[PDB]
Write a protein that binds this ligand. Sequence first.
Ligand SMILES: Oc1ccccc1Cl
Length: 351
Amino acid sequence: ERPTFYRQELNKTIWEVPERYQNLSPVGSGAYGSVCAAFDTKTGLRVAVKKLSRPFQSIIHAKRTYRELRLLKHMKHENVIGLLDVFTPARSLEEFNDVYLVTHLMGADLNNIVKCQKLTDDHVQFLIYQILRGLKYIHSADIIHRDLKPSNLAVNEDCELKILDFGLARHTDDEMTGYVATRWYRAPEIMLNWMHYNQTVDIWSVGCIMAELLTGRTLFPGTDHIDQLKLILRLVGTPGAELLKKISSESARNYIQSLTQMPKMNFANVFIGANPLAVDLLEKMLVLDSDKRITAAQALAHAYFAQYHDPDDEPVADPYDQSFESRDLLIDEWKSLTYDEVISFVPPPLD
Ligand SMILES: Oc1ccccc1Cl
């Protein structure tokens, strides 16, 4: 039952893959892992094959490997990335070192859609509808994506959308620093490690993305964390008394209280020309108090999506057992857990 593998070196990396994958072409490397595009002869699909870099190099990296695999094996939804395959060339746990993941090859992401194309309001409705449908699913499993931004959303020629890679390993400090797209969609409460936070951080991200689709420009293109905060508070207003209570870092409170009080702006005067319903939705997403932000299931029922909303076709997820997150194991234990997950993988049907 084990398939036959063949080897080849591409840009100083050995790839050993099942024969079913053909015409491997390097596509990139850095998000630690090399990625090749290939043709999968068994499904007829163009696929991206990611070879993980040093998956069990430390406890941290081994747990991260486990976490990514568990998450990708769970996601089964039209608007979310899933796993077509996962494999290793090893024939036993004792020689298990390398892990390859396989998913659908995506073309365009939303960034180059917003940069290269004029979207109508109908396109904005459809794109945002699909992000919220996918996010309803994700959140119903008690998973937080954490890294929703246009480059993480694949969009095909029919404007059909998929949410791609989850924020799994926290980004390094340096890659969130300065004038960088990496931070522009992040919710204020997690911009610094200064509050604990919920699923609705992803809803803030969606509001930022929706605003950019509507204007064609970044809503909060901050030059650093503090510049970005000031852009945010200028739009949504400074926190009142109700909300300053709920903040618990004293140092955060203390900086926040140094700021001059600003009222919430009028969104109809920021988003000139936009559908009044879109503006209404944005006001419900872009709220500082994260307890009061609209949820994805709530947002799907908003009147802006009246032409796409179907309550019998917005599925929720099977339960996702995340108890491993609180568990402490050695490298070889994490690794053996990963091996069982590779070995038990069962592919999606061609129907
Ligand atoms: O980003 C991913 C995820 C799973 C498989 C392949 C790639 Cl490139």
